[PDB]
Amino acid sequence: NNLGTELDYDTFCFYYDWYGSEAIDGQYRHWAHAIAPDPNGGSGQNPGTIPGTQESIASNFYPQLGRYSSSDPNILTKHMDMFVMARTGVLALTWWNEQDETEAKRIGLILDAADKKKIKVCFHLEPYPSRNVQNLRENIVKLITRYGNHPAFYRKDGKPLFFIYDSYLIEPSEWEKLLSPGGSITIRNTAYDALMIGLWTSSPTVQRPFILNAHFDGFYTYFAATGFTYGSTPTNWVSMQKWAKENGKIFIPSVGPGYIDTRIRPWNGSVIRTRTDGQYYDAMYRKAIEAGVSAISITSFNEWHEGSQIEPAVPYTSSEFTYLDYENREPDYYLTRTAYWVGKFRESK
Ligand SMILES: OC[C@H]1OCC[C@@H](O[C@H]2O[C@H](CO)[C@@H](O)[C@H](O)[C@@H]2O)[C@@H]1O
8 A cells, every 4th residue: 555644663652651540550650740859949849749630630731531541451542543643653662670560561451552553662761770781681681582572562674672761871881791792791693682772962072982882773862852952952963864874873863742841840941842833843853854864753652741742632721730732733733743744754765
């Protein structure tokens, strides 16, 4: 078929599975969330918590699906249909190494639901406690062993792919042990080889030798807020792509529709990026495509705390908060606008 509606398997959408309901999970997990103290606000702050009631959730927006559970198979079905609408072929699943049966259940449910719609799943390896290259290797082995034969497990030219968030928290000399073909605990040329995509944050003078010396296969930028880092400044993407191509690296810039996290970080208003009825998303996605990249990542499907989600949101005013909403656009606008950009990306590929 050549309908201009098929999934794109070089488009990765960051997905969060940490939402809970009292009924399914015992608590409205993540809809309830601690409010962060101001890191520049001095001592004795008592910022409190967002309780995750119907009226007061830990987002500046409000989900069309309500305070859902990430463990609810019926929600997962709906999410996969939303991925199909968006044409996003890869779900990049947050992974916190919780070592708990409820995590294991969720991951299996997500893989199963994804496969019904021919969506693929890869893992976004988060900065879990004491993360280091040895336990990373062990966890990569575990994930490939447990899930590598699942039909929804993502591969690119035969290799799994992992995104590594805050990869700068680990020195290049440690990464080399895992990721150089000669490394002490290498995955290269083993059953557990994978494309390892590190987080490019700051200036080229720092990031270029970091990526080379660490032996990452590529890099991504994550942040949905333009200008938050050098890497999330889209005017740098042409030059970042040129460097990537020269050095055999895969650049996967991250694009998002906006940013606002002031319910959970009230002091963080300088990072707000307004959606402007889709014009912000359009500008960022256009820059990624114009840079000539081979793959794009989307921040985010459903990071509701940070206001970067493309998942449908609805107008809502409760007695506790007046939420933002998609304004003049309909609740599914960011899904269908993603599909528009996926088509432009494919036309360019
Ligand atoms: O997936 C990479 C990162 O994406 C942004 C969120 C971040 O998690 C931190 O922030 C959220 C709030 O937005 C907290 O709920 C988490 O516990 C964590 O501090 C991801 O690491």
